[PDB]
């Protein structure tokens, strides 16, 4: 009975204007139509032909196949009155199957952003839907929750006004595993706020113009193609936008985490290094290319898999794009080129291979061509660097033991030099940028997703580690925490255990004191002389061998590994060379040779080198020491989850994996989330304010005297004959049911519109007569 919506709006809204067909409604009689198992569909409808007690005979309404099962293998179907509902909390029948369906529909129908209780589901489309634009941005501005359909721009506005309203900083955190969307959703949130709070093509402020070129830079050298992300966010990200007392943007900051540079030296099978490498090798000019010593793509041994092409992307133009981004910011002409040369130099260090002398076992530099070409990029001395990296003029302090390393340790040192001379740079930029994009503040957490391959290095451990941490946070703030306020206030509540806690699987890798954790152990065990990748592993079992979330490697093919029972699954990490990096070993000989290099830029890069290794804190704790900072401020803000869900592992759109999608929902505590939302009173309000607002809706309630905010509020609620089951009364605050407040809000708004219209007109008059008075003055001048 409503408006008509184009093919495009057929991606935001739904198609309801249809015939009151009695077909789907007639069949209602066979209410015996339920859900049931499947190997290819996961679920499917079927009707009970005979309930044989604990086991009922059924036949799927698809292949007329008579597949019978237990009276506990079926599943309650929801009326066709819900097909593709906006807020799944509305479904009268909540099932592992029901929700799967809904998501099935809207996804395959162009709608991804769904709503699940307080949080929101967001299956990956993998397509280019026309639902993001200057237009849609408008359509949602000021638009309430229900006054429009579920969309990323929707959450952005909801969060933003919530902050401005209850004066309480906020946070939007996108969950989900690697490849599901996390990023894009964050970008949309920022894109929206950039214009919806400023002061396609549009004229934003000046910082918003740059605040826009923030991520297109960190994605360059920081993001890279993996076997589950053509452009994977290869590190953690936390953007914090700072609003004024008038909800306007004024500053923005990003806290970069775990820059997996460890791939800069040797990228895996069918993968690439940090995009920027190729953008330069191809985006550079014959001249500039000759100005930094950059050769071909299959020429550098630093580029494994030779050269990999990224679909729908031309690093050739991509370079120009990324270059343009820098400029918008403040990266001067030179300020950019300076960084560029560094990249080519780092790539070069890769060609520096040693010939382990048979005679003395000391590496050799036959053809110095390599080194010669790298020094001129560093600004350091040839001969000097050559000898330093070669013959370390060590300084054990208590002496001056000059030694020499094999070709190996000679290589292992130049490798951990280039690989860290880059990260020395990543953080250079991030703080170069964060300088320009900088009471209230909104937080956008773009962490990394639960990845699990065939070789689970250390990096991949803290990566998934962080995931589990955020996952715990969700469960906590959701089921745990909330319930607490019910108990505290005293409201007639009761606890319900949602079976969602990963504290254990965390301690197994967290707690240092008391039983030590996988990282705790590695930590010191690495400070030891006769310490090895191996030795470590055994220590781990020597104490944790009795942990559920812990499990003894099945295959010890030749090396040593172990797997953990994460929330997202199990992963067989290979402890090899773990302690080897937990300490960050490195030839400080050349290090201080750089510290005093002619290349100011590279000089400024390593200018503060009083932490290098020549023999403080372990990577592990250095991390959990900052990844602890995070969760400290988060718990101090208001969480806003954007549960991005990957659709399929084929990297193909239009395809939606059944179970995969189904399990993600389970290992994301979706269903349980919706349970609390509709089970409890996900809303509360201190008396004072409640009565302060919703009184105009209840004038003749409270006497004239100043009485108890409790009894006063009680009288109000009683007047509107509120059903004693939507709300729950407490000490000093009310726990209303969902939307039970939206109604009050709308009713109150209605009871003032006119007055607002009347005054609005008065304000217009003032405005009209005022502007016209100023123009009149110009003419006379």
């Amino acid at each position: 009975a409503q408006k008509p919506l184009s093919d495009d709006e057929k991606f935001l809204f739904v198609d309801k204007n249809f015939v009151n067909n009695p077909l789907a409604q007639a069949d209602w009689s066979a209410k015996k139509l339920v859900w049931v198992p499947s190997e290819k569909h996961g679920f499917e409808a079927a009707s009970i032909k005979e309930e044989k007690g604990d086991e009922v005979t059924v036949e799927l309404q698809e292949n007329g196949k008579k597949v019978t099962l237990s009276k506990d293998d079926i599943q309650k179907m929801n009326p066709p009155k819900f097909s593709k509902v906006e807020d799944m909390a509305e479904l009268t029948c909540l099932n592992e199957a029901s929700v799967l369906h809904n998501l099935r529909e809207r996804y395959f129908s162009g709608l991804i952003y769904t709503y699940s209780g307080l949080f929101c589901v967001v299956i990956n489309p993998y397509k280019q839907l026309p639902i993001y634009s200057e237009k849609i941005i408008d359509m949602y501005k000021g638009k309430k929750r229900h006054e429009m359909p579920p969309h990323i721009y929707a959450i952005a506005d909801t969060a933003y006004r919530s902050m401005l309203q209850d004066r309480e900083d906020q946070s939007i955190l996108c969950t989900g595993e690697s490849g599901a969307g996390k990023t894009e959703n964050t970008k949309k949130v920022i894109q929206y706020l950039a214009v919806v709070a400023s002061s396609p093509s549009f004229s934003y402020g000046e910082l918003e113009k740059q605040l826009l070129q923030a991520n297109p830079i960190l994605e360059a050298f920081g993001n890279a193609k993996t076997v589950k992300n053509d452009n994977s966010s290869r590190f953690g990200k936390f953007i914090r936008i700072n609003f004024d007392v008038t909800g306007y943007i004024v500053g923005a900051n990003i806290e970069t985490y775990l820059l997996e540079k460890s791939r800069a030296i040797r990228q895996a099978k069918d993968e690439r290094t940090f995009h920027i490498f190729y953008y330069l090798i191809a985006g550079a000019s014959e001249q500039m290319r000759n100005d930094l010593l950059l050769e071909g793509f299959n020429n550098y041994t630093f580029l494994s898999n030779g050269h990999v092409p990224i679909p729908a992307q031309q690093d050739d133009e991509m370079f120009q794009e990324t270059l343009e981004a820098m400029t918008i910011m403040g990266f001067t002409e030179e300020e950019q080129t300076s960084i560029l040369r560094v990249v080519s130099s780092v790539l070069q260090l890769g060609n520096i291979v040693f010939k382990k002398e048979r005679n003395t076992d000391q590496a050799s530099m036959p053809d110095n061509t390599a080194a010669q070409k790298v020094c001129h990029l560093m600004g350091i001395n040839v001969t000097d660097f050559t000898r330093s990296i070669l013959t370390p003029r060590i300084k054990v302090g208590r002496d001056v033991v000059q030694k020499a390393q094999t070709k190996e340790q000679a290589d292992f040192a130049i490798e951990a030099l280039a690989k860290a001379k880059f990260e020395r740079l990543f953080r250079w930029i991030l703080t170069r940028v964060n300088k320009a994009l900088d009471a209230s503040f909104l937080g956008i957490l773009d962490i990394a997703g639960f990845e699990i391959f065939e070789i689970n290095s250390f990096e991949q451990l803290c990566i998934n580690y962080t995931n589990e941490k955020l996952q715990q946070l969700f469960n906590h703030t959701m089921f745990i925490l909330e319930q607490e306020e019910y108990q505290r206030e005293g409201i007639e509540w009761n606890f319900i255990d949602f079976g969602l806690d990963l504290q254990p699987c965390i301690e197994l890798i967290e707690r240092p004191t008391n039983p030590p954790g996988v990282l705790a152990l590695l930590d010191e065990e690495c400070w030891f002389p006769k310490a090895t990748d191996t030795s470590f592993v055994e220590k781990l079992i020597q104490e944790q061998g009795n942990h559920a979330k812990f499990q003894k490697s099945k295959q010890l093919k030749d090396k040593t590994e172990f797997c953990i029972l994460h929330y997202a699954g199990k992963v067989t990490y290979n402890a090899s060379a773990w302690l080897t990096k937990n300490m960050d070993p490195l030839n400080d000989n050349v290090t201080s040779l750089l510290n005093q290099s002619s290349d100011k830029f590279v000089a400024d890069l390593w200018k503060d080198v009083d932490r290098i290794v020549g023999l403080f804190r372990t990577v592990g704790q250095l991390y959990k020491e900052q990844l602890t900072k995070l969760m400290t401020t988060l718990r101090n803000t208001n969480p806003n989850f954007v549960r991005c869900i990957i659709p399929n592992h084929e990297k193909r759109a239009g395809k939606l994996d059944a179970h995969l999608v189904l399990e993600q929902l389970r290992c994301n505590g979706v269903l349980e989330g919706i349970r609390i939302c509709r089970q409890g009173f996900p809303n509360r309000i201190v008396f004072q304010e409640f009565r302060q607002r919703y009184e105009i809706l209840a004038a003749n309630a409270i006497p004239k005297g100043f009485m108890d905010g409790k009894q006063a509020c009680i009288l109000m609620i009683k007047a509107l004959e509120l059903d004693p089951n939507l709300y729950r009364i407490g000490q000093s605050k009310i726990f209303f049911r969902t939307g039970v407040l939206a109604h009050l809000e709308e009713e109150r708004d209605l009871k003032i519109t006119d007055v607002i219209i009347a005054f609005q007109a008065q304000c217009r008059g003032y405005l009209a007569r005022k502007a016209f008075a100023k123009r009149q003055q110009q003419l006379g001048s």
Partner: protein, 148 residues
């Protein structure tokens, strides 16, 4: 309207036109009326305009002589808001009875309820009433527009 004031009325009217056809654009009527010290709602004007369309509004004409009947008619109505009730509604937004609302609470309202005033209207309207904490006392804002 009086002859002396009616004459001045004409002046103010013709002062509202770029070129000189002596015609007040159909859209360019509201401000003309208001300028004459009238606070007609964004409805009345439309009602008296036969309810033209935005398209025709930008390409319609109105001679001062043609405008005259409309002016008086509009000038003569029945009700007009005031402090008593005006603010009354403004009070309802009071954080906790601060006798003063914020710059957003106000801005948002005045641009999401009824005859929504553009971001500008709201911003430049109160622009200067919001203090350090950015609060705008209504029991004084309304007055600035009314008595003003």
């Amino acid at each position: 309207f009086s002859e002396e004031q009616t004459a001045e009325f004409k002046e103010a009217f013709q002062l509202f036109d770029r070129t000189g056809d002596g015609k007040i654009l159909y859209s360019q009527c509201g401000d003309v009326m208001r300028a004459l010290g009238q606070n007609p709602t964004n409805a009345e004007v439309m009602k008296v305009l036969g309810n033209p369309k935005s398209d025709e509004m930008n390409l319609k004409t109105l001679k001062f002589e043609q405008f005259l009947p409309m002016m008086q008619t509009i000038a003569k109505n029945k009700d007009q808001g005031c402090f008593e009730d005006y603010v009354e509604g403004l009070r309802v937004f009071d954080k906790e009875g601060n006798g003063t609302v914020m710059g957003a609470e106000i801005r948002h309202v005045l641009v999401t309820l009824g005859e929504k005033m553009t971001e500008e209207e709201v911003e430049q309207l109160v622009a200067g009433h919001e203090d350090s904490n950015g609060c705008i006392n209504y029991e004084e804002l309304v007055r600035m527009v009314l008595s003003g």
